[PDB]
């Protein structure tokens, strides 16, 4: 896989960020993570969801360098969102969220699974430490 530079435009949620990639604006969905949805209709946000959002936002808003890493599967979903791993100064947001107990590891999607073991491992650790959603 290859890391590509991007620039923060705006963080939308724990699992969605808007970036400038190859010169044009684009919305990315964090691969292999399942978060407590905050941007929803009649759902009254979700338990830990505002912490996952603040986490993601803190992480990318304060970073010097954002990078995007597409996987080898399908690269966009049916809503036109890029499907990728996001890196903030070398640290993967996807993994951080899971390590910190603010997301579960999602089912693999359309062949996109390169970092799934790494992610499942972070998830066991958080479970073991009874972090946030595992509290």
Data resolution in angstroms: 2.0
Instruction: Show which residues are catalytic.
Output: 29, 37, 81
Residue 10, SS3?
strand
Look up residue 50 and give its two tokens: 């505002």
Strand partners, 24: 21
Domains of the chain, residue spans: 1-135
Residue by residue, DSSP assigns 47-108 as TTHHHHHHHHHHHHHT-S-EEEEE-SS--B-TTS-EEEEEEETTEEHHHHHHHTTS-EEPPP
SS (H, E, C) 19-36: EEECCEEEEEEECCEECC
Experimental method: X-ray
Fold of 1-135: OB fold (Dihydrolipoamide Acetyltransferase, E2P) (2.40.50)
């Amino acid at each position: 896989l290859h890391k590509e530079p991007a620039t923060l435009i705006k963080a939308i949620d724990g699992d969605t960020v808007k970036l400038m990639y190859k010169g044009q604006p684009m919305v990315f969905r964090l691969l292999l993570v399942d978060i407590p949805e905050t941007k929803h209709p009649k759902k009254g946000v979700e338990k830990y969801g505002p912490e996952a959002s603040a986490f993601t936002k803190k992480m990318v808003e304060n970073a010097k360098k954002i990078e995007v890493e597409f996987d080898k599967g399908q690269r966009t979903d049916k809503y036109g969102r890029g499907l990728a791993y996001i890196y903030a100064d070398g640290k993967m947001v996807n993994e951080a969220l899971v390590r910190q107990g603010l997301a579960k590891v999602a089912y693999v999607y359309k062949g996109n699974n390169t970092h799934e073991q790494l992610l499942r491992k972070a998830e066991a650790q958080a479970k073991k430490e009874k972090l946030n959603i595992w509290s």
